[PDB]
């Protein structure tokens, strides 16, 4: 297929270029923002991301910084003003990245340590009291499937609102309220990124800390 | 003639009168958390902020209903 | 958005986030651990020197 | 800091005196964080040391048995 | 012509105005649990967290109604 | 043409806006039982758990209405 | 064609949005009776149990409306 | 064709969503009378029982509406 | 054919969902007057009985609406 | 045929579900004024009676809507 | 035939169920202002009367909606 | 015939039952601000007046909906 | 004929009764924040004002629904 | 009639960038006093205090 080239190339170039740029900052230094960004991000993320403990090591800061910096390009492009050629990558990559990252992170993080015995044999007291097999399927399917609806609804609503507000605000007549309405896009993108990163880190740490 | 009434009535009825519970719950939670957090400063550091986590459930309340609006337009 | 979007959007974000975080975890962890190592070394050296 | 005079009276003579500001003491319902500008609220003080700033930044833990706010 | 009005009216009427009870109950439980949990330190994490288990009942309240929405679309 | 509108309107109207009382009552009972149960230690687990038995009545309130939904589909 | 819309609309409108008052009253009475019954020991089992008798009136409230549902099906 | 829609819609709309005020008032009066009657001993059985007389007014409130249901069936 | 739908819809819509405010207000006034009248002895019978006079206004609230029901039957 | 449905629907919809706010406000004002007026002796008859003047506003609230009912009958 | 249903439905729907918020707010403001104004002597007539100015906003709330009723009759 | 039902139903449905939230919020904010502002002298005019700024948001709530009424008449 | 009823009913139903949650939450948050901020001045500087940030969520609640009104007019 | 984007973009970008950068430059620029003052004051105070 020759179509869908500007969305995949523009999204993969901006996402891979801004996400695959941490390899050159290993030796230093670099300026006055290295101590404030590294100390504030490491101290605020490590001190505020309570619930990991025995979860992982570099997956918290690497998944949080890589997911926030890599996923921030889909919602930080609201300032670019100017037809279905560069907007499907945000809605498709947002729901696909949130659902695939939440399901793959929860299943891979929960099926690594402990484990196969708790997930492969979740009956006994959890499905025998309660002798009917409906509580494990309803509670397990709803609790295990709530991340796809929450991440797909938050990421889909944030990407749809940012792309719809950017396209409608950049493709209009006058340039007053549409060109000056940056508070809803900036507050919605910052609140969506902070709420998605805090909800994903807190949900992964809380869901991974107990079985 | 059922596409206009079905799509418009489905999008307006499915994404219309539904934000009253989320908007009322946000104001009630903000007022209760503001009164409880204002009545005690020591409790305004690692307790009342946890109530903000309840806002994370709003996306699973009426805000998810808007996700069905595309079914009456895009789908 | 008609076709050929799930493979590019899913493989781009999944391969970029996983390939970027897996290959950038030691650089961001070792490069970002200077604040905790320097703060712990200075606080432990000052507290151990004052207590000693 | 110092603002309002939060003098403490014991059963015999005076227990404590001097001004006070951000007095983070526990009330009748539980742990609270009062400071300078609170309204009149008569509570009860039970047992337990409460770290409250006295004068010129004197965060002292005043521990007593009974108390009437 | 009854499939568009029946499916759209069933999905919008069955998955429309229903999140007011769950969104209002989440805000009321979050505000009451935040005030009661913040008013006492020892009660900050010993019983108030059990109130979060009440959120597990939300999946059996309005959130289960969305499970019927497929009956107006996929089924 | 009355089977689609009657079954869809009966399933959506009979299993639609009805979980507001159960979801609101679960949050109100969880917040009141959490505040009253957390305000006292001896009252943390002696009678407050009996309030959870009230949740057993929810199955006889709105949750029973879903039992009639099959009458608009299977029956 | 009036039997499907009349029976379905009568069963859905007569046995639909009606359990909000009973489900809300059960949660409010359970939370108030749990807080008032747990706030005092002697009041834990002497008069608070009489509040459970109020639940006996629920059968004469919305639960009786379900008794009319047969009129839209069996009768 | 107006007898089935008028009788079914009249009985369902006249004997449907109406028990919310009676069921909510019974639970609110039972919880308030249980908390106020249980908070004091002398107030346990001296005037609080008079609140039960208020329940006698319920028969003249929503319960009287059911008396009109026969007008949509027997009359 | 407009006499059955107009008379039945007028009597059911005019004398149907309207007793929620009177039934809820009677229970709220009975519970508040019972708790406030039972919390003090001197206030048990000196001014609290005047609150019963408020019940006399109920006849001018929803109970008066039933007076219009004859307009959909006798008139 | 529009006179019966227009007059009946206008009188029932214009003078139907509207007394819930007035009946609820009368019971809430009577309970709050009864508790606040009975909690203190000097406040039994000095300013609490002024709350009864608020009842005079009820004639300008839902009670005025009945004044439009003649427009669906006499006019 | 659209003038009778459009004017009657516009006047009844535009001037019908709308006084619940104004009548409920008048009773809630009268009860809260009566309890707070009667609980203290100095607060009996110094700022509580300013709450009556809030009643002036009622004319810009539901009472203004009646101003549109002429559009369904005189205009 | 769609202009009368569309314009009348759009103006009545868009500018009808919507002032209950603004009228209820004005009375609740006036009663709470009057009780809290009258309970203390120093708090009578220092921050309580800022609550009046919340009334400025009413123009962005239901009062803005009236701005759409011209779309069902002038536009 | 479905464009006028679908567009007018979609804009009125999608931008009509929806401001009750935002207007009620703004008044409840303003009253609770005004009472809590008025009872303690030390907390009226960097705590209760944070509740105003909750108003920023209103634009993502009912106020966002108005953003869909153009879909029933401009789109 | 027209667009007028230089006034809104220049006024909003210069006002938000100058106000946010100038008012927020103390939190991002003054954050080095903890590591710099803790490492310099910790090493100098620990070496001089331990030596004396």
Short mmCIF file of N, CA and C in Angstrom, two decimals, chain D residues 35-39, chain M residues 38-42:
data_model
loop_
_atom_site.label_atom_id
_atom_site.label_comp_id
_atom_site.label_asym_id
_atom_site.label_seq_id
_atom_site.Cartn_x
_atom_site.Cartn_y
_atom_site.Cartn_z
N UNK D 35 -2.59 26.96 62.09
CA UNK D 35 -1.54 27.96 61.96
C UNK D 35 -2.05 29.32 62.41
N UNK D 36 -1.64 30.41 61.76
CA UNK D 36 -2.12 31.73 62.17
C UNK D 36 -3.27 32.23 61.31
N UNK D 37 -4.47 32.25 61.87
CA UNK D 37 -5.64 32.70 61.14
C UNK D 37 -6.85 31.80 61.34
N UNK D 38 -6.74 30.84 62.25
CA UNK D 38 -7.83 29.92 62.52
C UNK D 38 -8.92 30.61 63.34
N UNK D 39 -10.14 30.09 63.22
CA UNK D 39 -11.28 30.63 63.95
C UNK D 39 -11.37 30.01 65.33
N UNK M 38 -13.26 29.88 54.61
CA UNK M 38 -13.66 30.94 55.53
C UNK M 38 -13.46 30.54 56.98
N UNK M 39 -13.57 29.25 57.29
CA UNK M 39 -13.36 28.79 58.66
C UNK M 39 -11.90 28.84 59.08
N UNK M 40 -10.97 28.85 58.12
CA UNK M 40 -9.55 28.90 58.41
C UNK M 40 -8.84 29.78 57.39
N UNK M 41 -8.29 30.92 57.80
CA UNK M 41 -7.62 31.79 56.82
C UNK M 41 -6.25 31.27 56.40
N UNK M 42 -5.56 30.53 57.27
CA UNK M 42 -4.24 30.02 56.93
C UNK M 42 -4.30 29.05 55.75
#
